[PDB]
Design a protein around this motif. Structure first.
Motif, mmCIF file in Angstrom:
data_model
loop_
_atom_site.group_PDB
_atom_site.id
_atom_site.type_symbol
_atom_site.label_atom_id
_atom_site.label_comp_id
_atom_site.label_asym_id
_atom_site.label_seq_id
_atom_site.Cartn_x
_atom_site.Cartn_y
_atom_site.Cartn_z
ATOM 1 N N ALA A 66 -12.699 0.516 9.542
ATOM 2 C CA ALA A 66 -11.525 -0.237 9.998
ATOM 3 C C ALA A 66 -10.632 0.528 11.006
ATOM 4 C CB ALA A 66 -10.706 -0.720 8.805
ATOM 5 N N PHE A 67 -10.707 1.864 11.058
ATOM 6 C CA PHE A 67 -9.988 2.648 12.069
ATOM 7 C C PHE A 67 -10.528 2.418 13.493
ATOM 8 C CE2 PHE A 67 -7.203 5.971 9.962
ATOM 9 C CZ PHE A 67 -7.291 5.452 8.683
ATOM 10 N N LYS A 68 -11.751 1.909 13.624
ATOM 11 C CA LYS A 68 -12.391 1.619 14.915
ATOM 12 C C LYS A 68 -12.422 2.847 15.868
ATOM 13 C CE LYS A 68 -11.805 -3.324 14.312
ATOM 14 N NZ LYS A 68 -13.220 -3.540 13.884
ATOM 15 N N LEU A 69 -12.767 3.994 15.285
ATOM 16 C CA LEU A 69 -12.934 5.230 16.052
ATOM 17 C C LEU A 69 -14.360 5.245 16.624
ATOM 18 C CD1 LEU A 69 -10.879 7.604 13.844
ATOM 19 C CD2 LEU A 69 -10.400 7.253 16.267
ATOM 20 N N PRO A 70 -14.594 5.989 17.739
ATOM 21 C CA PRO A 70 -15.915 6.063 18.350
ATOM 22 C C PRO A 70 -17.062 6.372 17.378
ATOM 23 C CG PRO A 70 -14.324 7.171 19.738
ATOM 24 C CD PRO A 70 -13.588 6.729 18.528
ATOM 25 N N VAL A 71 -16.819 7.238 16.389
ATOM 26 C CA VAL A 71 -17.829 7.567 15.380
ATOM 27 C C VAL A 71 -17.297 7.531 13.952
ATOM 28 C CG1 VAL A 71 -19.332 9.436 14.447
ATOM 29 C CG2 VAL A 71 -19.372 8.861 16.927
ATOM 30 N N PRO A 116 0.802 -1.227 0.000
ATOM 31 C CA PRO A 116 0.000 0.000 0.000
ATOM 32 C C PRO A 116 0.834 1.276 0.000
ATOM 33 C CG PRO A 116 -0.813 -1.571 1.598
ATOM 34 C CD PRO A 116 0.495 -2.072 1.170
ATOM 35 N N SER A 117 0.326 2.285 -0.697
ATOM 36 C CA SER A 117 0.963 3.579 -0.824
ATOM 37 C C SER A 117 0.018 4.612 -0.175
ATOM 38 C CB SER A 117 1.242 3.870 -2.286
ATOM 39 O OG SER A 117 0.074 3.709 -3.056
ATOM 40 N N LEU A 118 0.493 5.256 0.883
ATOM 41 C CA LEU A 118 -0.305 6.199 1.675
ATOM 42 C C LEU A 118 0.370 7.520 1.951
ATOM 43 C CD1 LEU A 118 -2.880 6.396 3.697
ATOM 44 C CD2 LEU A 118 -1.224 5.544 5.421
ATOM 45 N N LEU A 119 -0.395 8.601 1.799
ATOM 46 C CA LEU A 119 0.036 9.940 2.151
ATOM 47 C C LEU A 119 -0.756 10.327 3.387
ATOM 48 C CD1 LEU A 119 1.399 12.734 1.682
ATOM 49 C CD2 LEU A 119 -0.617 13.343 0.299
ATOM 50 N N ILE A 120 -0.064 10.813 4.411
ATOM 51 C CA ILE A 120 -0.678 11.325 5.625
ATOM 52 C C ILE A 120 -0.344 12.810 5.746
ATOM 53 C CG2 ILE A 120 -0.901 11.211 8.114
ATOM 54 C CD1 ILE A 120 0.032 8.293 7.991
ATOM 55 N N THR A 121 -1.371 13.661 5.836
ATOM 56 C CA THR A 121 -1.200 15.115 5.957
ATOM 57 C C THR A 121 -1.869 15.607 7.233
ATOM 58 O OG1 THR A 121 -3.222 15.521 4.636
ATOM 59 C CG2 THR A 121 -1.110 15.510 3.468
ATOM 60 N N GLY A 122 -1.362 16.695 7.803
ATOM 61 C CA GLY A 122 -1.952 17.340 8.972
ATOM 62 C C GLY A 122 -1.680 18.830 8.951
ATOM 63 N N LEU A 179 -4.850 -1.412 6.459
ATOM 64 C CA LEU A 179 -4.191 -1.241 5.162
ATOM 65 C C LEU A 179 -3.093 -2.291 4.895
ATOM 66 C CD1 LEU A 179 -3.942 2.634 4.866
ATOM 67 C CD2 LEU A 179 -5.470 1.175 3.500
ATOM 68 N N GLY A 180 -2.566 -2.935 5.943
ATOM 69 C CA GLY A 180 -1.540 -3.955 5.817
ATOM 70 C C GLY A 180 -0.133 -3.399 5.823
ATOM 71 N N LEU A 181 0.042 -2.204 6.388
ATOM 72 C CA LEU A 181 1.339 -1.522 6.425
ATOM 73 C C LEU A 181 2.184 -1.883 7.639
ATOM 74 C CD1 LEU A 181 0.054 1.730 4.834
ATOM 75 C CD2 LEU A 181 2.112 0.434 4.053
ATOM 76 N N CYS A 236 5.974 -2.891 4.830
ATOM 77 C CA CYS A 236 6.010 -2.876 3.384
ATOM 78 C C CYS A 236 5.426 -1.583 2.871
ATOM 79 C CB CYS A 236 5.164 -4.053 2.878
ATOM 80 S SG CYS A 236 3.417 -3.931 3.379
ATOM 81 N N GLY A 237 5.321 -1.477 1.551
ATOM 82 C CA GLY A 237 4.648 -0.359 0.911
ATOM 83 C C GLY A 237 5.362 0.959 1.065
#
Lengths: 289, 314
Positions: free
Chosen positions: A139-144, A42-48, A189-191, A74-75
Motif C-alpha cells: 500500500a506504500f506504493k514504493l518502487p520495490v 489507527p495507532s502508529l509509531l514512526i521511528t528514524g 492506514l486511514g490517518l 483521526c487516530g
C-alpha cells in the motif's frame, strides 16, 4: 536506582504534544517526541535515525511532524525522529521505547538506514500477520517491496505490525519518493485523506514485489577494496560482474570478480570501500514464482 | 634497526611493483605500502598518491586503473604510484591514522623516530619526493561532502610557480578549477610547494569516476608523459564559505553545480533537542555556484556546510 524511563507529557492529551522520552543513565538521554492524539482510529509509531551517519529518515520524520497537525484526521501518531542521538545505553533506549511507546500503538513504521556506505532502492522490506504486514507494505506504493529472508523483534515481542522502509546513503537516495510513499501508507492506514499515487522514480510510476535469498546476497571472498560495477535497479544475468575486489598487499596481484549467481535485479550495493571476507557487498532480488 | 627503503630499484627500466617499507617504531610494527613504478627513460617525473584519508576509495581505485594503463600508455619519463599511502586509515574506515590520530598529510615531512603517521611521511619524503618534480594527490574532500570533480589551487606569492601550477591544473579539463586561499597548507603543501618549489596538484573527491579518469589522462598529456589529444575557473572567498550558526541536523537544499542567487536558501538547520522549535535557514551571500555541500548530517555550531564559488574576473 534513580528513575524509570518517562515521557515529559501525557500521551492521552488530545491534539498535538511535543516533548521528550527520557532514558535513564552514560548520562540521561532526552529524545524528542511528537504525538498527535485525535481519538479513535489507527495507532502508529514512526521511528528514524538508527544510524547517525545517514539522516534522510529523520528529515522525513520532521517534515511529517510539521504537516500532521493540519492533515491528520483521526487516530494516534507518535514520531521519534532520531532514536540513536549519540550515534548498556542501546539496551536502555530499546527498553524505554518498549515500555512507553510500543504499548499504545498497533503498528510501527521504522525509517531504517543501512548507512552511508550502501545504495538501495526506495523500498519496504518484510522478513496471517505476514499477509497483513505485506498488504500494508505494498500500500506504500514504493518502487520495490522486498521479501527478505533487533527492532522488529521488540515490535513482534508485543505482537504489533512492523513495517520497515529502507534508506541508504548512496546516489539512488529520492527523498520525495519516500515522502510520497509514507503519505500513501498513512492514506492506506486511514490517518489522512487523499488517494495513493506512485511517485516518479527513474522516469516511471510502478511498484514491484521481489524476493531475496542466500544465493542473491553476494559476499566478498576475502579482504580488500570492493569496487561496485552496477547500480541499484540494474537487471543482471547469471555470471555478470557485480563488483571487483582489489587486494591491498600488492600491485601485481590480480583482482577478484564478484559475480551474480542468477538472473536478478540489484536491490542494494555497497560503495567503494575496504571490506573483510564474508561481508555482503550486494543484495540481488528476483520476482516471485 | 631499519631505515625506510623501497624493496626494488626505481632505476630499473620498465614496469616495477614492490613496497615502501616504513620501519617499526614505538607505536606499531613495520608497514609495507605497495608501490608501482614505470620507468620509460628520459622525460618528466611524477608521483601519484591516493588514500591519505581512509574513507575515500575512488582515488585508490583510479590509482590502480593508472597502474594497469600506464604500461602501454606512458611514452617517457618516470611515474611512481602509491594508491593507498595510509593503509591503516583505509582499513579502519577512519579519516586519519587510527594509531596516532594524526592526519598524515599535515605531518609531512615527518620524522624517522616519530609516531606511525610521522614515519610514513618520513619514508615518502626520503625515498619518493627527491626523485619527482610533480606530485598528483587524489584527495579526499570529505565523505560527508559532495563536491565538483575539480582541482583546488591555493594562491601563493611566487607568481611563476602559481602560473605554472594553475596552467597545468586547467589542462586536466575538469568541470571546475577552484582558486581558494584556504590556508590548510601545513605539511605536504608547505613541503612540496614552498620548501621544494615543485608542482603540487590536488584533485578533489567527495563522498557523493570516468570524469576523473579523463581528467587525469588530460593532465598526463599536459605533462608530456602520455601522448594523445586531451571547464570553469571559479574562486571562493570567506563570504562563500557558509557555516551553521548553531548545532543541529543540516539538510542540504541545493546540489553541486547549481547556480544560486544572492539570498537563496542553500540549506536548513533543524535543532537537535526540540520538535517544537523552528528550523534555521542558511542563505547564500552572493550569486554563486555550488562547489561543495554537506550531506544531511549532524553539525556543531560554526561548521562549514557549503562552499560556493564565483567565476574569476575575465
Amino acid at each position: 536506582m534513580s528513575e524509570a524511563p518517562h515521557l515529559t507529557f501525557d500521551l492521552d492529551t488530545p491534539g498535538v504534544s511535543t516533548g521528550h522520552l527520557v532514558v535513564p543513565k552514560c548520562e540521561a538521554l532526552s529524545l524528542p517526541v511528537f504525538s498527535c492524539n485525535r481519538g479513535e482510529g489507527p495507532s502508529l509509531l514512526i521511528t528514524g535515525g538508527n544510524h547517525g551517519n545517514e539522516l534522510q529518515g529523520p528529515i522525513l520524520a520532521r517534515r511529517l511532524v510539521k504537516w500532521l497537525p493540519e492533515a491528520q484526521r483521526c487516530g494516534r501518531i507518535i514520531i521519534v525522529p532520531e532514536i540513536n542521538p549519540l550515534a548498556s545505553v542501546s539496551e536502555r533506549i530499546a527498553d524505554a521505547i518498549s515500555r512507553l511507546l510500543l504499548p499504545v500503538v498497533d503498528t510501527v513504521l521504522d525509517l531504517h538506514s543501512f548507512g552511508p556506505t550502501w545504495d538501495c532502492a526506495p523500498s519496504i522490506i518484510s522478513h496471517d500477520q505476514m499477509t497483513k504486514t505485506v498488504s500494508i507494505s505494498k500500500a506504500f506504493k514504493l518502487p520495490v517491496t522486498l521479501l527478505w529472508e533487533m527492532f522488529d523483534t521488540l515490535v513482534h515481542r508485543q505482537g504489533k505490525t512492523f513495517i520497515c522502509t529502507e534508506f541508504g546513503g548512496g546516489v539512488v537516495s529520492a527523498l520525495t519518493i519516500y515522502e510520497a510513499g509514507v503519505r500513501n501508507g498513512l492514506i492506506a492506514l486511514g490517518l489522512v485523506k487523499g488517494k495513493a499515487e506512485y511517485p516518479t522514480f527513474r522516469q516511471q510510476k510502478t511498484g514491484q514485489t521481489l524476493e531475496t535469498t542466500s544465493s542473491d546476497q553476494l559476499k566478498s571472498p576475502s579482504p580488500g577494496i570492493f569496487e561496485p560495477r552496477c547500480s541499484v535497479m540494474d537487471e543482471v544475468e547469471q555470471g555478470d560482474v557485480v563488483g571487483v575486489l582489489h587486494p591491498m598487499g600488492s600491485l601485481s596481484a590480480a583482482s577478484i570478480d564478484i559475480r551474480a549467481q542468477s538472473k536478478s535485479t540489484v536491490f542494494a550495493i555497497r560503495s567503494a570501500m575496504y571490506v573483510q571476507g564474508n561481508e555482503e557487498v550486494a543484495i540481488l532480488a528476483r520476482p516471485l514464482a
